[PDB]
Amino acid sequence: LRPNPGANKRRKRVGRGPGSGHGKTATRGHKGQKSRSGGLKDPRRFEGGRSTTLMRLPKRGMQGQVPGEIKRPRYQGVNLKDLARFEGEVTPELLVRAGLLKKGYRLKILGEGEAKPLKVVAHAFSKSALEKLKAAGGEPVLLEA
Amino acid sequence: MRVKMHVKKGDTVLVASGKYKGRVGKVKEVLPKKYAVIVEGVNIVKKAVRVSPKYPQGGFIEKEAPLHASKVRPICPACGKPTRVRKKFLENGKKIRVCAKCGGALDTEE
RNA sequence: CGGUGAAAUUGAACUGGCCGUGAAGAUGCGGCCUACCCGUGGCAGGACGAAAAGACCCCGUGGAGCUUUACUGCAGCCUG
RNA sequence: CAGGCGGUAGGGGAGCGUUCCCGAUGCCGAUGAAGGCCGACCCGCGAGGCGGCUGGAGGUAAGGGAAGUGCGAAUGCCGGCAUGAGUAACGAUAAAGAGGGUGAGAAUCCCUCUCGCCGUAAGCCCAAGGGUUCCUACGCAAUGGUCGUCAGCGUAGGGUU
RNA sequence: GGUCAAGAUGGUAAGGGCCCACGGUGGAUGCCUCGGCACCCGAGCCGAUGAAGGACGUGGCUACCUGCGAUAAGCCAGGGGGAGCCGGUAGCGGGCGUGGAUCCCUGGAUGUCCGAAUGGGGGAACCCGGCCGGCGGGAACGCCGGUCACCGCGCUUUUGCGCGGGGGGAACCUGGGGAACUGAAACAUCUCAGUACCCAGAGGAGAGGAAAGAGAAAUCGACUCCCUGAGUAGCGGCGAGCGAAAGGGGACCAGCCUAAACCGUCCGGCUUGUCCGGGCGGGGUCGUGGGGCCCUCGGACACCGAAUCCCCAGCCUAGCCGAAGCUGUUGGGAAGCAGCGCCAGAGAGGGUGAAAGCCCCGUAGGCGAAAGGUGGGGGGAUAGGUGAGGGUACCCGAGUACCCCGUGGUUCGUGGAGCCAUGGGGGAAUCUGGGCGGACCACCGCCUAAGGCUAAGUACUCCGGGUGACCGAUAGCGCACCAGUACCGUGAGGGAAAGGUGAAAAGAACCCCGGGAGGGGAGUGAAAUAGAGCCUGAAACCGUGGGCUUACAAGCAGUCACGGCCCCGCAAGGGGUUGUGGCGUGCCUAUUGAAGCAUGAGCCGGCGACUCACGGUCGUGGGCGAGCUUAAGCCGUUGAGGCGGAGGCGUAGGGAAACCGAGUCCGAACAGGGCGCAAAGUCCGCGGCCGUGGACCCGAAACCGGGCGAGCUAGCCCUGGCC
């Protein structure tokens, strides 16, 4: 019976009509009622087409794969891991499958600060990966179908 | 005050009223409880007709409205009405029992 | 005189002429000349009189009705 | 101390009532809910209290939430009420005047007496289509373009085989 | 005191102007409802035993609203039920009933005439007819009556006996056929869209519904509906735009069959032997066999989609109880202020003359109950019919698959364009069979087509119940109660208004002007400025009285000043009223621009227009940085929230890609651009804000669909008359 919205929250701009005294809202006739006019963009659309193109995604719906999920040895070792075996499987918490564009696809070796690899078998190890993987101390592996 | 009722010809009390002096309930409807306690009317200073004396002004005015009347009165006045325990083969006897009691036995009085 | 008892148009108006003036044809703003209160039966000038958001127009990459060997098809005819 | 403060379009800020939702119904109230009617304390305002009259029962907020909402104004929408107007108008230039009568009142009903216009129709007739009414008896506040004790008007009853 | 010359001021309204009092017509309207509307559950078929839907009837005395229909305010029987009823009329004039009367329900009976109508016709609701019965004056007449389409449907070819349908229905529903606008700011591909609408038809819900499927993992496994799947994959004057599918989360989870010659059986066949035809079957393919020969076989658990029957049949409408106060008291009132005493697994609400747990209410408390009409459950029985192993020459689910063009689907608009689907011509395979993944070819894989049946989970709303930061009589259904009727239109078709007197009728005897209305009194009563259109009852406009004011005056208005009146006043002074004067072009819209002579504007009153859903997007108020949770399952007066972890957004990105990767594509180039740079977002809200949706609001020419009319008018046809 008291806690009114703290700061501002509550209705901030449902400003009614056009002006305390006066009122009318905008320009001149060009924007009447049935006036949801020249929408998004006129000459901007000209641009839109304005150019040949080199990106063609043809008559279809069934592409292959080579799973590009950006994973980071940095989140890993900085503070959420097990320096030898984690595997795609163990990466749930990992913020490299817990987002959206390929959750379950493939975890690559964002080899960065300090070493730059992966000491846990898997798939996605930058070349830089293979190398600092070998330095950091890791057993990486990669079986198929 | 519905398809169901309170007392009938009965004999009862006037709480919120002007009389309280209970007495003969000459008639009581089914829906509008409309009941006449023969306890407060008028004259309708009649037609001027020979319907009433050629020189008229009806007398017995008695349409009893309000329902704050304290129906039923055993050796007890204001009391609700019980129901049954049957007791006998085929026994409704929704007689009135509370504190004192009265059921309007078909005898000595209604 | 008596019985009767409507109808558009219109801010409200108590609304002279002037010479002037003003968006450029004014009772209503300027300076000035006459002229009190009211009403009837008339006379048509103004108040752009009423009347209908001009059928003159323009304008609206508006509509609709012919048309023509404009554009595309439909019909029916002719035809492997 | 600056220092500024005409100012639509338009952009920013900040308040106003307004009917509902909690209203953690507080209740207030027949010594009145409410809307109303009037008023030289409150508000920089949108509003406020408060006083007085009406008026018959509601109404509601301390704090916050929800919105068919605040309107001259759109030849607007619906309902009133005005205006020329007590002038224009009464539906045909086929005219009517009297006497007595009945009546609460009769230019405007009834008889009867003078009189004009139809007559080739303002004739009768069948039919159509109307479908009450026709009659007889009461009545007129509505209706006839005022009348009106008259009616094809209102009330009732009977009426065509 | 009188005469004359001069000057200055005064009152005197027919009406009008501002102010005050008091009326009237007008209904705002505050509140108030047996009335809507919104969501959710319940419910979901009517009809020839001629229905839905109406015409004319009856109520002693009734136009009408009612219910019945000719046995007509109803008769019968059973279920229910407490003592009153002869519906809304209360009035008249008569009644039935505790030897369950009014009435609530379930099954009863005639059940007028119309309406599918059907015995025939016909402008429906009215006129005709043929058969047996009857009565009357017999025959002729004429009534009750039972009687007599049509359809296709199967049965005895002769019953033409015995069935079926048809006729409806607010919305949902399947297929049949199927359109312009508007967008694409033109517009012809395109678009709205397979949308509106005409139709046919099965239902109570149909729809679809056991795979020549998916999809590529050596995977799934009916069909339907929800969330997600991307609005990506993509379709395209690649433009406006349009836009999937497997999977995953969820819900709901039966699967079952027939001709399929072979068997034999059989009857008809033709014509006889050994072909076809049609009945019984075993076979009667579920994810593949089925049949016929040889051998191992085999001697009790399975119910349907109602197989089916009996039940606690859920209800239908009637049921029942059921908690505790009185004294006082201010009041016309009290249920109120006050006193003490009271209930509570039931302080949900309404109702009893102003606001009660203990007063009215058969409610929340809990419980109740029936011999009819409906079944899921739980279980039984009824159980058709399913339910083995190898061997062997094979014959045994469709008449067209398939391929040419002509077309439909589909996220496909013509394309390299696949699969299903059909209009033309071609024109076959039995499990080495044949369509399907990749136009197509070589593979593997997939499924088993060209028959059949149905449940269960999303839709829909006529009808019932309930709840509403959903409405109050101009909003709500237009419609709150003799509104889908008044009334306009030819028909099609359009389509109002009017809610409240009061607490209860005690609503007005009676006297008085009057033809009447209506007007003064008496009584009403708490009021009648509560008096019958009669609550609250304001603005507008017209009225009766009072104050100031007004006849040498030129001005929207006004209004600053002041002076004369009159007013409350203690004075201060405050009111209203103005004559003298100063200065003052009225407001809205669209205008370079308005006094307008440009416009809107008649006056009052109530209505009267920047929203909602998402997408988003930027802000900013709030939770953790990885942050947040749909569809559901579950607990839920209050119904209490909890859980549900298919996801989408982040978390490097760079590229047409191959990919590489914090690096990177160009590239043979150490030169640039996307960065690296986290400088964490992610979610909830509130809000400026676009995109789609009618998105400030009402506004047009018109285009398109389906119907409506020749008593419209011109024509033509038939048929009288008149000149």
Coordinates of N, CA, C and O (backbone and C1' of nucleotides) in Angstrom, one line a residue, chain E residues 22 39 73 76 81 89 98 124 129 141 163 178 196 201 257 276 278 290-291 306 325 350 362 417 451 514 543 598:
Chain E
rC22 P -36.0 32.8 -6.3 O5' -37.5 32.6 -6.8 C5' -38.6 33.0 -6.0 C4' -39.8 33.1 -6.8 C3' -40.1 32.0 -7.7 O3' -40.7 30.9 -7.1 C1' -40.5 33.9 -8.9
rC39 P -15.3 -13.2 -26.6 O5' -14.7 -13.8 -25.2 C5' -13.4 -13.6 -24.8 C4' -13.1 -14.4 -23.5 C3' -13.4 -15.9 -23.6 O3' -12.2 -16.5 -24.0 C1' -14.5 -14.9 -21.7
rA73 P -58.4 -23.4 -22.9 O5' -57.3 -22.7 -21.9 C5' -57.2 -23.1 -20.6 C4' -56.4 -22.1 -19.8 C3' -56.2 -22.5 -18.3 O3' -55.1 -23.3 -18.2 C1' -56.8 -20.2 -18.4
rC76 P -56.8 -36.1 -15.9 O5' -57.3 -37.6 -16.2 C5' -57.2 -38.1 -17.5 C4' -56.0 -39.0 -17.7 C3' -55.2 -39.1 -16.5 O3' -55.7 -40.0 -15.5 C1' -53.8 -38.9 -18.4
rG81 P -40.7 -33.2 -2.6 O5' -41.3 -31.8 -3.2 C5' -41.2 -30.6 -2.5 C4' -42.6 -30.0 -2.3 C3' -43.3 -30.3 -0.9 O3' -43.0 -29.3 0.1 C1' -44.8 -30.6 -2.8
rU89 P -51.6 -8.1 -14.2 O5' -52.5 -9.1 -13.2 C5' -53.3 -10.1 -13.7 C4' -54.8 -9.6 -13.6 C3' -55.8 -10.5 -14.5 O3' -56.4 -11.5 -13.8 C1' -56.0 -8.2 -15.0
rU98 P -59.2 -31.8 -0.4 O5' -57.7 -31.8 0.3 C5' -57.5 -32.3 1.6 C4' -56.1 -32.2 2.0 C3' -55.8 -32.8 3.4 O3' -55.6 -34.2 3.5 C1' -54.9 -30.6 3.3
rA124 P -49.0 -17.7 -53.0 O5' -49.7 -19.0 -52.4 C5' -50.6 -18.9 -51.3 C4' -50.8 -20.2 -50.7 C3' -51.8 -20.3 -49.6 O3' -53.1 -20.5 -50.1 C1' -49.9 -21.4 -48.9
rG129 P -65.5 -32.5 -55.8 O5' -65.4 -33.8 -56.6 C5' -64.9 -35.0 -56.0 C4' -63.7 -35.5 -56.7 C3' -63.3 -36.9 -56.3 O3' -64.1 -37.9 -57.0 C1' -61.4 -35.5 -56.3
rC141 P -73.5 -36.1 -54.5 O5' -74.6 -35.4 -53.6 C5' -75.0 -34.0 -53.7 C4' -75.1 -33.3 -52.4 C3' -73.9 -33.1 -51.5 O3' -73.2 -32.0 -51.9 C1' -75.7 -34.0 -50.2
rC163 P -42.0 -50.7 -43.9 O5' -40.5 -50.7 -44.2 C5' -39.8 -49.4 -44.3 C4' -38.3 -49.6 -44.6 C3' -37.5 -48.4 -44.7 O3' -36.9 -48.0 -43.5 C1' -37.2 -49.7 -46.7
rG178 P -13.8 -21.9 -62.0 O5' -14.0 -20.6 -61.0 C5' -14.7 -19.5 -61.4 C4' -15.0 -18.5 -60.2 C3' -13.7 -17.9 -59.6 O3' -13.3 -16.7 -60.3 C1' -15.3 -18.7 -57.9
rA196 P -13.8 -16.1 -47.1 O5' -14.6 -15.1 -47.9 C5' -14.8 -13.7 -47.4 C4' -15.7 -12.9 -48.4 C3' -17.0 -13.4 -48.9 O3' -18.0 -13.2 -47.9 C1' -15.8 -12.2 -50.6
rG201 P -28.3 -31.2 -51.8 O5' -27.2 -31.8 -50.8 C5' -26.5 -33.0 -51.1 C4' -25.3 -33.2 -50.2 C3' -25.4 -33.3 -48.7 O3' -25.9 -34.6 -48.4 C1' -23.6 -32.0 -49.2
rC257 P -7.7 -57.3 -39.0 O5' -7.4 -56.7 -40.5 C5' -8.0 -57.1 -41.6 C4' -9.2 -56.3 -41.9 C3' -9.9 -56.5 -43.2 O3' -10.9 -57.6 -43.1 C1' -9.5 -54.2 -43.1
rC276 P -12.3 -67.4 -66.4 O5' -13.6 -66.6 -66.6 C5' -13.7 -65.6 -67.5 C4' -15.1 -65.2 -67.7 C3' -15.7 -64.9 -66.3 O3' -15.5 -63.6 -65.9 C1' -17.1 -66.4 -67.6
rG278 P -19.1 -61.4 -61.2 O5' -19.8 -61.7 -59.9 C5' -21.1 -61.2 -59.7 C4' -22.0 -62.3 -59.1 C3' -21.7 -62.7 -57.7 O3' -22.1 -61.9 -56.6 C1' -22.1 -64.6 -59.0
rG290 P 1.2 -64.9 -45.0 O5' 0.3 -64.8 -46.4 C5' -1.0 -64.5 -46.3 C4' -1.8 -65.1 -47.5 C3' -1.7 -66.6 -47.7 O3' -2.6 -67.4 -46.9 C1' -1.4 -65.5 -49.7
rG291 P -2.4 -69.0 -46.8 O5' -2.7 -69.5 -48.2 C5' -4.0 -69.3 -48.8 C4' -4.0 -69.7 -50.3 C3' -3.7 -71.2 -50.4 O3' -4.9 -72.0 -50.4 C1' -2.3 -69.9 -51.9
rA306 P -16.1 -49.1 -29.8 O5' -17.4 -48.1 -29.4 C5' -18.3 -47.7 -30.4 C4' -19.7 -47.9 -29.8 C3' -20.1 -49.3 -29.6 O3' -19.6 -50.0 -28.5 C1' -21.7 -48.4 -30.9
rG325 P -30.9 -16.1 18.8 O5' -30.6 -14.9 17.7 C5' -31.4 -13.8 17.6 C4' -31.1 -12.9 18.8 C3' -31.8 -11.6 19.0 O3' -33.1 -11.8 19.6 C1' -29.6 -11.5 19.8
rG350 P -25.4 -6.8 -2.0 O5' -26.8 -7.4 -2.5 C5' -27.2 -7.3 -3.8 C4' -28.5 -8.1 -4.0 C3' -29.6 -7.5 -3.1 O3' -30.3 -6.6 -3.9 C1' -29.4 -9.9 -2.9
rG362 P -35.9 -19.3 0.5 O5' -34.6 -20.2 0.6 C5' -33.9 -20.3 1.9 C4' -33.3 -21.7 1.9 C3' -32.5 -22.1 0.6 O3' -31.1 -21.6 0.7 C1' -33.9 -23.9 1.3
rA417 P 13.8 -28.5 -65.3 O5' 14.4 -29.1 -63.9 C5' 13.6 -30.0 -63.2 C4' 12.5 -29.3 -62.5 C3' 11.3 -28.8 -63.3 O3' 10.2 -29.7 -63.3 C1' 12.0 -27.2 -61.6
rG451 P -7.6 -47.8 -57.0 O5' -7.7 -48.2 -55.4 C5' -8.3 -47.4 -54.4 C4' -9.5 -48.0 -53.8 C3' -9.8 -47.7 -52.4 O3' -10.5 -46.5 -52.2 C1' -10.1 -50.1 -52.8
rG514 P -70.5 28.4 -13.0 O5' -69.6 27.4 -14.0 C5' -68.9 28.0 -15.1 C4' -68.2 26.9 -15.8 C3' -69.0 25.7 -16.3 O3' -69.7 26.0 -17.5 C1' -67.0 24.9 -15.4
rG543 P -41.6 37.1 -24.0 O5' -42.8 36.4 -23.1 C5' -43.1 37.0 -21.9 C4' -43.9 36.0 -21.0 C3' -44.2 36.5 -19.6 O3' -45.4 37.2 -19.7 C1' -43.2 34.4 -19.5
rA598 P -13.8 38.4 -49.3 O5' -14.7 37.1 -49.0 C5' -15.1 36.2 -50.1 C4' -14.7 34.8 -49.7 C3' -15.5 34.2 -48.5 O3' -16.7 33.6 -49.0 C1' -13.1 33.9 -48.2

